Design a protein around this ligand. Structure first.
Ligand SMILES: OC[C@H]1O[C@H](O[C@H]2[C@H](O)[C@@H](O)[C@@H](O)O[C@@H]2CO)[C@H](O)[C@@H](O)[C@@H]1O
Length: 371
């Protein structure tokens, strides 16, 4: 049961949940309506489990990719912003939360992964993945490492996997072919092999997760990490002298991070849909609401035109958009959970040296005269 006369909001533990609570406290002061913000573990799997039986939060925050599956399961109210409000957000962000012709969430901000580097350890960041092994050797002599990032979530490895030809679903003339998954082609496998080669040569560790990689970068132990805008505030606190830049190329080609649009859906079972609307349109999606969240954990490039223009001069945001442009927007189709399962299992299996993903490489006889 979802309680009438208040709002419960769920958002991931890596985002600005304290900032969101401040927006909630402003809502309460104006309207008398209490706003509870929670950040439960494995939210993206907990939400569909509790919402299916009419439980869970009034409002769910996640990247847009999961929303088509939620909508297909009947978990989301249709949202009905008027034209005046629609004009306040960028068309590209609205289309990210459109599913089979209908708006199914409010878009909040555009996210992509970037390379984050410690300027005192690394005054010029590497342009290529290929130079990282040597760079790590140089740093290991000083009791440091080149690179740590989260290897438990396939989101973080995706940019490397996609670089030489990995894709989610084939997309042509506005239509996905869900039978044509690009997680096991030559390009994808080259990315996975490179990843395995880093692990096997002890430049990275298969067990490294979000918190381990954050702690290492933010304590000055490792020169680089890969993360999204949300991570910048913990780095500010640590006072490491960092830059945010374009991801390294692989086989000459840009890394292709998936682009997510942080989105806010309204639970179909909420008796507080009107309060949810009023909170999202008139409190969160304002200059002052987004400032409060962004000052907790940065959102990236916000959907709200007025505030996105204010922040756009931030070179960390400029780097985020450069990387986003090189990558692709996540599909929101219900088969996205199946894509992520496929990649998650492939990445975990490869890193851990399981028999399924184990291959002998350097078997190809190439013509190589130059160059
Ligand atoms: O890993 C958390 C981090 O990445 C997320 O990307 C997700 C994707 O959105 C999910 O649906 C999931 O199944 O796959 C990726 C993780 O492997 C979010 O986009 C991002 O905001 C979040 O903080």
């Amino acid at each position: 049961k979802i309680e009438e006369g208040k709002l419960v909001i769920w958002i991931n533990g890596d985002k600005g949940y304290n900032g969101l609570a401040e927006v909630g406290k402003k809502f309460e002061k104006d309207t008398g309506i209490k706003v509870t913000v929670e950040h439960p573990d494995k939210l993206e799997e907990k939400f569909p489990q509790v919402a299916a039986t009419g439980d869970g939060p009034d409002i769910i925050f996640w990247a847009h990719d999961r929303f088509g599956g939620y909508a297909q399961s009947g978990l989301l109210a249709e949202i009905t912003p008027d034209k005046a409000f629609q004009d306040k957000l960028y068309p590209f962000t609205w289309d990210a939360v459109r599913y089979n012709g209908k708006l199914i969430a409010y878009p909040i901000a555009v996210e992509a992964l970037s390379l984050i580097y410690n300027k005192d350890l690394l005054p010029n960041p590497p342009k290529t993945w290929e130079e990282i092994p040597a760079l790590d050797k140089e740093l290991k002599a000083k009791g440091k490492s080149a690179l740590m990032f989260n290897l438990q979530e396939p989101y973080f490895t995706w940019p490397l996997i996609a670089a030489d030809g990995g894709y989610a679903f084939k997309y042509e003339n506005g239509k996905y072919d869900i039978k044509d998954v690009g997680v096991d082609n030559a390009g994808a496998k080259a990315g996975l092999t490179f990843l395995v080669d880093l692990i096997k040569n002890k430049h990275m560790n298969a067990d490294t997760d979000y918190s381990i990689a954050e702690a290492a970068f933010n304590k000055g132990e490792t020169a680089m990490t890969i993360n999204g805008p949300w991570a910048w505030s913990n780095i500010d606190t640590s006072k490491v002298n960092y830059g945010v830049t374009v991801l390294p190329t692989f086989k000459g080609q840009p890394s292709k991070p998936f682009v997510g649009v942080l989105s806010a859906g309204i639970n179909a079972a909420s008796p507080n849909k009107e309060l949810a609307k009023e909170f999202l349109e008139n409190y969160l999606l304002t200059d002052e609401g987004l400032e409060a969240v962004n000052k907790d954990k940065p959102l990236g490039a916000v959907a709200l035109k007025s505030y996105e223009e204010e922040l756009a001069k931030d070179p960390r945001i400029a780097a985020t958009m450069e990387n986003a442009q090189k990558g692709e927007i996540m599909p929101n189709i219900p088969q996205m959970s199946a894509f992520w399962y496929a990649v998650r299992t492939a990445v975990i299996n490869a890193a851990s040296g399981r028999l399924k993903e184990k291959r002998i490489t350097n078997t190809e006889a190439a013509i190589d005269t130059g160059k």
